[PDB]
């Protein structure tokens, strides 16, 4: 009852059919510029468009090499390698790798999941080829860019009840690694997501080379010259949810926010953020995750972060997105450093909004001198200096339970009130707020 096919060419017809069970035989399959054309295997993008429903696709031991030149072969159009439009499909075990570093002519996404109740599991994805590569988003990720971009992102989860499970996503590309737009009940489970980092000092060292950053005098979209002393990801987010987007289910076009995301047992390394879901609606749940060397650990806005860990080497493990944040319940272990500290944000956590219940745990005994838990105040975060992104900084914190089971000191700013702090030691806690209560445990 399984059909086995032995070429990309014989695979492509099944993608238009419902209720099929298909296996692409073990092997290595290359897609090159010569394969894209009128006459040719791939006449249109997306390359692999899964239009059927109730189908299973087994790619065990399949290595699919897609030459990045393919991202230029469709004019000025977005190129998608794989898109699922149908429902109730299961794709498993494919190893997909972009070959070379050619940028898209416009933009690209490796995998887009529309429809409902689809699952991608056991994939291994390597994303390459984008422009500019080497500055992350410092010179723009959307309109009004200082340096025009031609982005290439990994997995875009949309649709309803779509699931990415046990996947390895390695990004060497300027774009999101795993992101959700218009997704309702998306689940990301057992995933390993990895980007790579570069110091702003190394970028600034391009002064006088004629580099694209050197040509705009390192002026960022945040309104100031790129500051020294930060470690950035070259990618946009590890797992990031958006409040906008369009998806398609059953031939209906749907424009909505992401809602009800669940992230379980993921490891995110060297990304801008491990898990950011503050812009999703409904119930946000994060459990069993490990965030290593990201610019930011967990920002879910409201909801539940439980049994999660992050290290602090490049940025805070925890950040309330806005003063509007309420009901963020979190239990976060500050993990031993995965590498030397290079955290220019001067904070292990930034807390405000109201009615949160936050527990931080750590075995760390050597505390860098610039790192503290902040309740309110002026965060020295790369993106929020000098009034940039003003709603994401300098905001009040009220009625918050803060269990500091760590040796990190705590700084309660004058805008904080009714913070109930319990701590290993209470002599590293600076209280400049109102009606805050400090108690040793």
């Amino acid at each position: 009852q399984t059909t086995t096919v032995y070429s990309l060419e014989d695979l492509l017809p099944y993608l238009k059919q419902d209720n099929v069970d298909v296996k692409l035989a073990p092997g290595t399959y290359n897609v090159n510029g010569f394969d894209v054309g009128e006459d040719r295997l791939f006449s249109t993008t997306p390359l692999f468009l899964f239009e059927g429903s109730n189908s299973t696709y087994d790619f065990t031991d399949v290595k699919l090499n897609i030459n990045t030149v393919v991202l230029t072969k469709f004019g000025n159009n977005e190129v998608n390698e794989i898109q699922i439009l149908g429902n109730n499909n299961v794709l498993k075990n494919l190893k997909l790798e972009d070959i070379g570093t050619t940028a898209p002519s416009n933009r690209a996404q490796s995998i887009v999941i529309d429809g409902r109740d689809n699952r991608i599991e056991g994939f291994h994805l390597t994303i390459r080829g984008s422009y500019p590569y080497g500055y992350g988003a410092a010179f723009g990720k959307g309109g009004g860019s200082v340096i025009n971009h031609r982005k290439h992102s990994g997995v875009l989860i949309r649709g309803l009840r779509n699931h990415l499970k046990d996947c390895t996503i390695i990004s060497r590309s300027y774009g999101h690694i795993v992101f959700m737009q218009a997704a309702s009940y998306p689940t990301v489970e057992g995933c390993y997501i990895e980007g790579e980092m570069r110091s702003t000092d190394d970028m600034l060292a391009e002064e006088g080379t004629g580099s694209p950053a050197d040509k705009v005098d390192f002026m960022t979209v945040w309104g100031y010259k790129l500051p020294a002393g930060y470690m950035m990801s070259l990618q946009e987010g590890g797992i990031r949810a958006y409040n906008a987007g369009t998806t398609y289910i059953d031939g209906v076009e749907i424009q909505r926010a992401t809602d009800n995301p669940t992230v379980l047992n993921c490891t995110i390394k060297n990304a801008r953020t491990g898990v950011t879901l503050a812009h999703a609606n409904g119930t946000k749940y994060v459990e069993g995750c490990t965030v290593l060397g990201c610019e930011n650990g967990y920002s879910i806005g409201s909801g539940t972060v439980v049994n999660c860990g992050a290290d602090a080497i490049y940025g805070p493990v925890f950040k309330n997105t806005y003063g509007s944040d309420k009901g963020y319940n979190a239990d976060i272990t500050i993990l031993p450093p995965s590498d030397a500290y290079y955290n220019g944000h001067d904070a292990v956590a930034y807390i405000g909004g109201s009615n949160h219940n936050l527990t931080f745990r750590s075995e760390i005994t050597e505390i860098p001198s610039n790192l503290k838990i902040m309740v309110s105040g002026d965060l020295q975060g790369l993106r929020v200096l000098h009034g940039s992104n003003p709603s994401q900084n300098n905001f009040a914190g009220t009625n918050i339970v803060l269990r500091n089971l760590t040796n990190f000191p705590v700084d309660l700013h004058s805008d904080s009130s009714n913070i109930t702090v319990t701590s290993c030691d209470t002599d590293n806690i600076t209280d400049n707020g109102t009606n805050n209560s400090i108690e040793a445990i």
Side-chain angles (χ1 to χ4, degrees), residues 71-72 75-79 103-108 149-152:
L71 307 174
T72 64
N76 206 270
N77 293 330
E78 180 181 76
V79 180
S105 307
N106 176 358
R107 47 172 189 173
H149 47 84
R150 287 178 293 130
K151 293 196 298 193
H152 184 178

Side-chain angles (χ1 to χ4, degrees), residues 48-62:
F48 295 96
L49 179 58
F50 290 84
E51 304 175 73
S53 303
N54 309 295
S55 293
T56 300
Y57 287 84
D58 170 14
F59 300 105
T60 297
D61 275 327
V62 173

Side-chain angles (χ1 to χ4, degrees), residues 34 64 69 151 285 381 422 440:
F34 291 90
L64 176 64
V69 71
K151 293 196 298 193
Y285 187 77
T422 52

Side-chain angles (χ1 to χ4, degrees), residues 125-335:
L125 175 52
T126 305
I127 311 143
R128 292 186 168 100
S130 63
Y131 177 88
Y133 192 59
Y135 312 123
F139 303 101
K141 49 177 170 168
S145 303
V146 181
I147 300 173
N148 291 330
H149 47 84
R150 287 178 293 130
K151 293 196 298 193
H152 184 178
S153 59
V155 180
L156 175 43
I157 309 180
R158 316 201 288 208
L160 170 63
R161 293 186 296 273
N162 282 323
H163 191 187
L164 190 60
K165 184 184 178 174
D166 297 342
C167 292
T168 294
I169 309 128
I170 314 296
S171 182
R172 298 299 177 264
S173 176
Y174 176 37
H176 286 282
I177 318 184
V178 175
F179 69 128
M180 310 156 175
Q181 290 177 348
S184 177
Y185 295 87
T187 300
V188 181
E189 182 180 6
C191 290
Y192 178 78
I193 291 144
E194 171 195 298
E196 71 179 335
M197 314 300 284
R198 180 184 186 200
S199 66
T200 53
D201 308 77
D202 189 78
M203 299 166 195
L204 284 163
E206 300 179 357
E207 276 131 21
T209 61
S211 86
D214 187 44
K215 283 176 289 247
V216 293
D217 295 342
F218 305 96
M219 176 56 53
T220 71
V221 286
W222 309 310
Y224 35 93
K225 195 183 187 193
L226 182 76
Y230 294 89
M231 183 70 76
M232 290 180 71
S233 185
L234 299 190
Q235 289 63 50
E236 258 188 287
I239 292 169
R240 160 74 169 260
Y242 277 85
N243 58 17
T246 305
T247 183
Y248 310 88
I249 303 172
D250 314 309
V252 179
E253 164 181 342
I254 304 161
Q255 205 293 300
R256 65 184 174 198
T258 302
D259 68 73
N260 295 287
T262 303
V263 182
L264 307 168
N265 302 318
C266 293
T267 294
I268 309 100
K269 179 181 167 65
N270 302 328
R272 184 264 175 275
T273 183
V275 184
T276 296
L277 301 178
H279 284 169
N281 296 327
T283 289
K284 301 167 262 187
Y285 187 77
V286 183
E287 177 184 6
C289 299
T290 305
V291 175
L292 299 172
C294 297
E295 296 184 62
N296 179 75
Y298 297 94
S299 303
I300 72 157
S302 68
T304 310
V305 175
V306 56
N307 188 25
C308 286
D311 76 350
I313 64 174
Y314 302 144
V317 306
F318 167 100
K319 193 186 164 285
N320 280 114
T321 305
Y322 302 122
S324 68
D325 284 22
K326 292 186 175 59
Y328 198 155
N329 304 329
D331 186 336
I332 292 173
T333 298
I334 305 176
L335 294 166

Side-chain angles (χ1 to χ4, degrees), residues 32-50:
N32 293 106
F34 291 90
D35 291 313
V36 165
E38 208 266 24
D39 179 41
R40 270 136 183 193
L41 196 69
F42 295 99
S43 84
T44 49
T45 171
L47 305 177
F48 295 96
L49 179 58
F50 290 84

Side-chain angles (χ1 to χ4, degrees), residues 54-127:
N54 309 295
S55 293
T56 300
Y57 287 84
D58 170 14
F59 300 105
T60 297
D61 275 327
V62 173
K63 183 184 285 215
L64 176 64
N65 298 324
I66 304 192
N67 203 293
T68 50
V69 71
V70 165
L71 307 174
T72 64
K73 295 299 242 87
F74 294 85
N76 206 270
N77 293 330
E78 180 181 76
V79 180
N80 296 329
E81 300 164 1
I82 293 171
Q83 175 160 19
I84 301 177
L85 290 198
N87 308 323
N88 293 293
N89 299 303
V90 175
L91 284 53
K92 61 203 184 80
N93 300 329
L94 179 66
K95 175 160 162 31
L96 178 62
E97 191 190 352
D98 295 329
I99 306 302
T101 54
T102 302
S105 307
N106 176 358
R107 47 172 189 173
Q109 306 161 49
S110 298
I111 301 188
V112 180
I113 318 182
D114 291 298
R116 56 167 176 82
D117 300 295
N118 299 297
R119 181 165 75 256
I120 293 193
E121 61 170 39
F123 272 32
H124 186 297
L125 175 52
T126 305
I127 311 143

